[PDB]
Design an enzyme around this catalytic site. Sequence first.
Site, PDB file in Angstrom:
ATOM      1  N   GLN A   1      40.319  33.023  67.483  1.00  0.00           N
ATOM      2  CA  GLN A   1      39.423  32.646  66.388  1.00  0.00           C
ATOM      3  C   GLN A   1      40.085  32.832  65.021  1.00  0.00           C
ATOM      4  O   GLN A   1      40.878  33.753  64.824  1.00  0.00           O
ATOM      5  CB  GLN A   1      38.115  33.448  66.457  1.00  0.00           C
ATOM      6  CG  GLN A   1      37.046  32.975  65.475  1.00  0.00           C
ATOM      7  CD  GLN A   1      35.732  33.711  65.596  1.00  0.00           C
ATOM      8  OE1 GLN A   1      35.699  34.933  65.724  1.00  0.00           O
ATOM      9  NE2 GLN A   1      34.632  32.965  65.556  1.00  0.00           N
TER      10      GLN A   1
ATOM     11  N   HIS B   1      28.434  48.909  23.884  1.00  0.00           N
ATOM     12  CA  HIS B   1      26.980  48.906  23.770  1.00  0.00           C
ATOM     13  C   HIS B   1      26.380  50.024  24.615  1.00  0.00           C
ATOM     14  O   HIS B   1      27.044  50.572  25.493  1.00  0.00           O
ATOM     15  CB  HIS B   1      26.401  47.558  24.203  1.00  0.00           C
ATOM     16  CG  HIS B   1      26.827  46.408  23.333  1.00  0.00           C
ATOM     17  ND1 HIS B   1      26.709  46.428  21.969  1.00  0.00           N
ATOM     18  CD2 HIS B   1      27.357  45.204  23.661  1.00  0.00           C
ATOM     19  CE1 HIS B   1      27.158  45.278  21.474  1.00  0.00           C
ATOM     20  NE2 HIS B   1      27.553  44.527  22.477  1.00  0.00           N
TER      21      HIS B   1
ATOM     22  N   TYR C   1      31.552  31.679  25.625  1.00  0.00           N
ATOM     23  CA  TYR C   1      32.216  32.937  25.305  1.00  0.00           C
ATOM     24  C   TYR C   1      33.712  32.699  25.143  1.00  0.00           C
ATOM     25  O   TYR C   1      34.356  33.297  24.281  1.00  0.00           O
ATOM     26  CB  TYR C   1      31.959  33.995  26.381  1.00  0.00           C
ATOM     27  CG  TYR C   1      32.203  35.410  25.899  1.00  0.00           C
ATOM     28  CD1 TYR C   1      33.491  35.920  25.795  1.00  0.00           C
ATOM     29  CD2 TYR C   1      31.144  36.233  25.543  1.00  0.00           C
ATOM     30  CE1 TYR C   1      33.717  37.209  25.352  1.00  0.00           C
ATOM     31  CE2 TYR C   1      31.360  37.524  25.099  1.00  0.00           C
ATOM     32  CZ  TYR C   1      32.647  38.006  25.006  1.00  0.00           C
ATOM     33  OH  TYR C   1      32.866  39.291  24.565  1.00  0.00           O
TER      34      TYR C   1
ATOM     35  N   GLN D   1      33.872  46.369  29.407  1.00  0.00           N
ATOM     36  CA  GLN D   1      33.866  46.689  27.984  1.00  0.00           C
ATOM     37  C   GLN D   1      32.641  46.122  27.281  1.00  0.00           C
ATOM     38  O   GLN D   1      32.225  46.622  26.236  1.00  0.00           O
ATOM     39  CB  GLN D   1      35.137  46.166  27.313  1.00  0.00           C
ATOM     40  CG  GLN D   1      36.380  46.969  27.642  1.00  0.00           C
ATOM     41  CD  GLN D   1      36.223  48.436  27.297  1.00  0.00           C
ATOM     42  OE1 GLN D   1      36.298  48.822  26.131  1.00  0.00           O
ATOM     43  NE2 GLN D   1      36.001  49.263  28.313  1.00  0.00           N
TER      44      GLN D   1
ATOM     45  N   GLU E   1      41.617  36.276  64.599  1.00  0.00           N
ATOM     46  CA  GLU E   1      41.512  37.063  65.820  1.00  0.00           C
ATOM     47  C   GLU E   1      42.574  36.608  66.814  1.00  0.00           C
ATOM     48  O   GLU E   1      42.725  35.414  67.068  1.00  0.00           O
ATOM     49  CB  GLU E   1      40.119  36.939  66.437  1.00  0.00           C
ATOM     50  CG  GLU E   1      38.997  37.532  65.606  1.00  0.00           C
ATOM     51  CD  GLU E   1      37.673  37.530  66.347  1.00  0.00           C
ATOM     52  OE1 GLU E   1      37.689  37.457  67.593  1.00  0.00           O
ATOM     53  OE2 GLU E   1      36.617  37.604  65.682  1.00  0.00           O
TER      54      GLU E   1
ATOM     55  N   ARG F   1      38.476  32.772  61.319  1.00  0.00           N
ATOM     56  CA  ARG F   1      37.485  32.678  60.252  1.00  0.00           C
ATOM     57  C   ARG F   1      38.159  32.761  58.887  1.00  0.00           C
ATOM     58  O   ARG F   1      39.157  33.461  58.729  1.00  0.00           O
ATOM     59  CB  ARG F   1      36.442  33.790  60.380  1.00  0.00           C
ATOM     60  CG  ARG F   1      35.553  33.699  61.607  1.00  0.00           C
ATOM     61  CD  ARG F   1      34.708  34.957  61.751  1.00  0.00           C
ATOM     62  NE  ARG F   1      35.538  36.145  61.935  1.00  0.00           N
ATOM     63  CZ  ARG F   1      35.065  37.384  62.019  1.00  0.00           C
ATOM     64  NH1 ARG F   1      33.761  37.607  61.933  1.00  0.00           N
ATOM     65  NH2 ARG F   1      35.898  38.403  62.187  1.00  0.00           N
TER      66      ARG F   1
ATOM     67  N   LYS G   1      32.263  26.860  64.955  1.00  0.00           N
ATOM     68  CA  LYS G   1      33.410  27.482  65.613  1.00  0.00           C
ATOM     69  C   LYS G   1      33.947  26.598  66.731  1.00  0.00           C
ATOM     70  O   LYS G   1      35.086  26.772  67.184  1.00  0.00           O
ATOM     71  CB  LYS G   1      33.048  28.871  66.147  1.00  0.00           C
TER      72      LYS G   1
HETATM   73  C1  LIG Z   1      42.760  44.874  25.606  1.00  0.00           C
HETATM   74  C2  LIG Z   1      41.239  44.543  25.613  1.00  0.00           C
HETATM   75  O1  LIG Z   1      41.141  43.132  25.633  1.00  0.00           O
HETATM   76  C3  LIG Z   1      39.972  42.578  25.075  1.00  0.00           C
HETATM   77  C4  LIG Z   1      38.810  42.476  25.876  1.00  0.00           C
HETATM   78  C5  LIG Z   1      38.831  42.985  27.330  1.00  0.00           C
HETATM   79  C6  LIG Z   1      37.616  41.908  25.342  1.00  0.00           C
HETATM   80  O2  LIG Z   1      36.488  41.830  26.165  1.00  0.00           O
HETATM   81  C7  LIG Z   1      37.587  41.426  23.971  1.00  0.00           C
HETATM   82  C8  LIG Z   1      36.367  40.833  23.389  1.00  0.00           C
HETATM   83  O3  LIG Z   1      35.197  40.716  24.139  1.00  0.00           O
HETATM   84  C9  LIG Z   1      36.364  40.364  22.040  1.00  0.00           C
HETATM   85  C10 LIG Z   1      37.544  40.471  21.235  1.00  0.00           C
HETATM   86  C11 LIG Z   1      37.555  39.950  19.712  1.00  0.00           C
HETATM   87  N1  LIG Z   1      38.462  40.710  18.898  1.00  0.00           N
HETATM   88  N2  LIG Z   1      39.407  39.956  18.525  1.00  0.00           N
HETATM   89  C12 LIG Z   1      40.622  40.361  19.019  1.00  0.00           C
HETATM   90  C13 LIG Z   1      41.343  41.371  18.142  1.00  0.00           C
HETATM   91  N3  LIG Z   1      41.389  40.966  16.851  1.00  0.00           N
HETATM   92  C14 LIG Z   1      42.000  41.818  16.147  1.00  0.00           C
HETATM   93  C15 LIG Z   1      40.127  40.769  16.365  1.00  0.00           C
HETATM   94  C16 LIG Z   1      39.377  39.735  17.182  1.00  0.00           C
HETATM   95  C17 LIG Z   1      38.725  41.041  21.792  1.00  0.00           C
HETATM   96  C18 LIG Z   1      38.733  41.524  23.186  1.00  0.00           C
HETATM   97  C19 LIG Z   1      39.948  42.100  23.729  1.00  0.00           C
HETATM   98  C20 LIG Z   1      41.185  42.201  22.839  1.00  0.00           C
HETATM   99  O4  LIG Z   1      42.087  41.225  23.174  1.00  0.00           O
HETATM  100  O5  LIG Z   1      41.765  43.518  23.006  1.00  0.00           O
HETATM  101  C21 LIG Z   1      41.984  44.324  21.810  1.00  0.00           C
HETATM  102  C22 LIG Z   1      41.003  45.090  21.182  1.00  0.00           C
HETATM  103  C23 LIG Z   1      39.557  45.187  21.607  1.00  0.00           C
HETATM  104  O6  LIG Z   1      39.407  46.025  22.736  1.00  0.00           O
HETATM  105  C24 LIG Z   1      39.555  47.398  22.468  1.00  0.00           C
HETATM  106  C25 LIG Z   1      38.800  45.780  20.443  1.00  0.00           C
HETATM  107  C26 LIG Z   1      39.239  45.082  19.139  1.00  0.00           C
HETATM  108  C27 LIG Z   1      37.310  45.698  20.609  1.00  0.00           C
HETATM  109  O7  LIG Z   1      36.697  46.623  19.719  1.00  0.00           O
HETATM  110  C28 LIG Z   1      37.260  47.939  19.698  1.00  0.00           C
HETATM  111  C29 LIG Z   1      36.901  48.941  20.802  1.00  0.00           C
HETATM  112  O8  LIG Z   1      38.015  48.266  18.803  1.00  0.00           O
HETATM  113  C30 LIG Z   1      36.859  44.271  20.315  1.00  0.00           C
HETATM  114  C31 LIG Z   1      36.247  43.674  21.545  1.00  0.00           C
HETATM  115  C32 LIG Z   1      35.904  44.108  19.118  1.00  0.00           C
HETATM  116  O9  LIG Z   1      36.486  44.544  17.926  1.00  0.00           O
HETATM  117  C33 LIG Z   1      34.512  44.723  19.330  1.00  0.00           C
HETATM  118  C34 LIG Z   1      34.275  45.777  18.324  1.00  0.00           C
HETATM  119  C35 LIG Z   1      33.419  43.645  19.167  1.00  0.00           C
HETATM  120  O10 LIG Z   1      32.256  43.907  19.469  1.00  0.00           O
HETATM  121  C36 LIG Z   1      33.764  42.245  18.633  1.00  0.00           C
HETATM  122  C37 LIG Z   1      33.126  42.036  17.286  1.00  0.00           C
HETATM  123  C38 LIG Z   1      33.264  41.204  19.625  1.00  0.00           C
HETATM  124  C39 LIG Z   1      33.181  39.863  19.303  1.00  0.00           C
HETATM  125  C40 LIG Z   1      32.673  38.894  20.365  1.00  0.00           C
HETATM  126  C41 LIG Z   1      33.644  37.792  20.709  1.00  0.00           C
HETATM  127  C42 LIG Z   1      33.005  36.870  21.735  1.00  0.00           C
HETATM  128  C43 LIG Z   1      34.949  38.344  21.284  1.00  0.00           C
HETATM  129  O11 LIG Z   1      35.852  37.581  21.576  1.00  0.00           O
HETATM  130  N4  LIG Z   1      35.126  39.789  21.491  1.00  0.00           N
END
Ligand SMILES: CCOc1c(C)c(O)c2c(O)c3c(CNN4CCN(C)CC4)cc2c1[C@H](O)O/C=C\[C@@H](OC)[C@@H](C)[C@@H](OC(C)=O)[C@@H](C)[C@H](O)[C@@H](C)C(=O)[C@H](C)/C=C/C[C@H](C)C(=O)N3
Length: 769
Positions: A225, A727, A267, A252, A213, A227, A18
């Site tokens: 101050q 999950h 991821y 989610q 501050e 910070r 400081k």
């Molecule tokens: C508007 C919500 O936006 C998201 C969000 C926030 C996400 O976190 C999404 C997400 O993690 C994924 C994914 C992968 N899914 N993609 C995108 C949609 N496509 C049609 C199919 C492939 C999307 C996330 C999304 C997405 O942009 O938002 C739209 C829909 C999802 O959120 C409701 C749905 C499709 C969700 O499942 C449900 C509730 O219908 C996704 C995540 C998915 O189908 C679920 C069932 C799932 O476990 C998949 C098989 C995960 C794959 C792992 C992979 C690393 C991945 O990219 N998953």
Amino acid sequence: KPYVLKFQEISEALVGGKGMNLGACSNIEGVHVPAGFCLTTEAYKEFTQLLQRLAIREISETIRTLIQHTQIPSEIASYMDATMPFAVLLQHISMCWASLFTEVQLAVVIQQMISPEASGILFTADPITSNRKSLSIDASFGLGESGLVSADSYTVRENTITNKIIATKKLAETRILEKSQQTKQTLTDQQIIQLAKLGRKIEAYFGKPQDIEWCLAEGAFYIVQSRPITTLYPIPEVNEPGNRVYISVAHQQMMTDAMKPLGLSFYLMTTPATMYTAGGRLFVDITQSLSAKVSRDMMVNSLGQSDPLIKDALLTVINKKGFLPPLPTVRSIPDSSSVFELVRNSENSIKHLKQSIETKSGSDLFDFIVEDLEELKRVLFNPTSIDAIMAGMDASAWLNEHIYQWLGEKNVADKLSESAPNNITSQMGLELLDVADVIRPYPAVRAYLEQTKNPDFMNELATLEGGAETKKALEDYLQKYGMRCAGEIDLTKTRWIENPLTLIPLILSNIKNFDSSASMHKFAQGEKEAFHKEQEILRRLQELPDGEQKAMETKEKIDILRHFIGYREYPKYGMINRYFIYKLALLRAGEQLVKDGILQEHEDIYFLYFEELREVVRTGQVDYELINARKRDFATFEKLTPPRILTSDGEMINGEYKRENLPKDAILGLPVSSGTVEGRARVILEMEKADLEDGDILVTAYTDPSWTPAFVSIKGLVTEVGGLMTHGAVIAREYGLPAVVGVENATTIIKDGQQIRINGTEGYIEILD
Ligand SMILES: CCOc1c(C)c(O)c2c(O)c3c(CNN4CCN(C)CC4)cc2c1[C@H](O)O/C=C\[C@@H](OC)[C@@H](C)[C@@H](OC(C)=O)[C@@H](C)[C@H](O)[C@@H](C)C(=O)[C@H](C)/C=C/C[C@H](C)C(=O)N3
Ligand SMILES: [Cl-]
């Protein structure tokens, strides 16, 4: 070098933290610190002997009788008078230094004691919403320091002081007050804005949002101050045009822990969504979706069915003017065999990956991983596999809405989902009971596991009566599931097979909580509840107007439900299987980099993103000051908590549940598994420290797939995040376990040991005592 330092005149190892702030504030334009000087580290220069000495750190403090009496030459103690009452002669400056001992150099700063008409604190980022564009001022008459004295609260976005909280500041050294003066603003609106405008400018030179501050003295706010604000959640670097809106992946994905760069990288390289990272976590940009009505009606409603807090938070964003730009003006179902073939195709893909990656090293490995990522996406987003997943989901929603419409039974698909076949995550949790069944008859092995903390404990079982049997049961289980762990989506996190000891408490709990075949009995009972429900529903439907058609279509949807809902958990399993295979290979490359003297520890690769790491292997050069920066970053990220909604202005928005007829002091959440239970609340953040027993209700931040073995003994589940089809929630239904997710600050509000009642049908929690 010198003995005394003024403030335009000023070196952290010379005048300290400081001692600088004031030094790098005197130079700023339009401002002026209170003037004065600084006593330098080079004034600090027996004391050393006592020092080398390092109950015993009780009386060694005799060291601070020493500075008080030690005296330090008048030369520098009149050299300082060579360059106004004070605050921070020499009584004090020295007794101060002493401060390093109770706990090495300290620099003392002395400034001006102006009699401020008003004095206060300033945040260029709103302390509540963390909106970068909202400036907050706390002002009180005279000197009032922080956050204690009755002080006016000013919220100035930009030239508009939106909210005024003119506190009845009654007790303004003298100590008393004038009544009419009491309720009047501290700063005039001209002064407020001037200071706001003042405040909104100092941040530029320093860079980031600042905690400033100030003190108002005969018409001037000059800075005592400044910070830096270190508590804000980082905005995703997305310079794309304008204001944007992000959705929390952690909520989610039921996993709110901060992730390491390498894990984050993988991821991001897997996802087809427009995803970004911030605060060691993941966020999805849904701004483009909100740019049109038909797309944003879809987006808002689709997400609302996952968890309503998203929808409510989105509506808040939409209702926020000046942010989001205004608006201009049946699925296929695969046959029976598909699920079995989708699994085998995934299994075979993993086998080929293992036989292929094993021969790769260096840049060959990274080239191979990029290529294999395409295969991951094919298995993960197979059109048929998606149809399989949606088949179970669509059946659930159809049942839930049609049965409640026909019979008034809410969320009937919960009971019907109970003990659904072919769920890899459910099997994992129940099969740990079988492991405990093997160990239970062996006393010598139990006495060992109940006590040991040896990571290599499995190598010491062979000497025990029943150790060979125990080690075998553990190996089989780890071959099937040793690839999961809390935060499995982070490739860098420690897997179960890398640390089997983390499974021992769960096993020990199972050994004492159950008898010889809990897995069979639990599963069979679920199969019975589910079928009894089916018979009841179909029976009660056939007494409705043309109910035999309703029953006929309900029977079809029920059959689809139990056939597909279990597969929902499998894509992540297959994905996690590749991630672990990737990890082991990357670790081998990390060790190779250490042998080459390029890395210091092979796990330092965790703080590099994939492309950065790939270049290191190729070029043979790293920037450790980047790695060390990443390590510091990740540490601060662990102290953060991801908001459900994050905006480009850094505003953290969590939705609010709409309370209608639900109990007064009840804690609202999202009902995902029907039922009402009372039990002892167990607030647990680490699963290996969970001493769970009969009647307990698990309260935790999140339950990703790896948390499932802790479900076998509890009578209810409460989490802070999650959604309808995420999950944990899906496993709660199949275990017949009442559950409420999306409960804000559940692990803080609910005290461990309290008797609570949760309602997994209406979605609330009641504290009983
Ligand atoms: C508007 C919500 O936006 C998201 C969000 C926030 C996400 O976190 C999404 C997400 O993690 C994924 C994914 C992968 N899914 N993609 C995108 C949609 N496509 C049609 C199919 C492939 C999307 C996330 C999304 C997405 O942009 O938002 C739209 C829909 C999802 O959120 C409701 C749905 C499709 C969700 O499942 C449900 C509730 O219908 C996704 C995540 C998915 O189908 C679920 C069932 C799932 O476990 C998949 C098989 C995960 C794959 C792992 C992979 C690393 C991945 O990219 N998953
Ligand atoms: Cl030990």
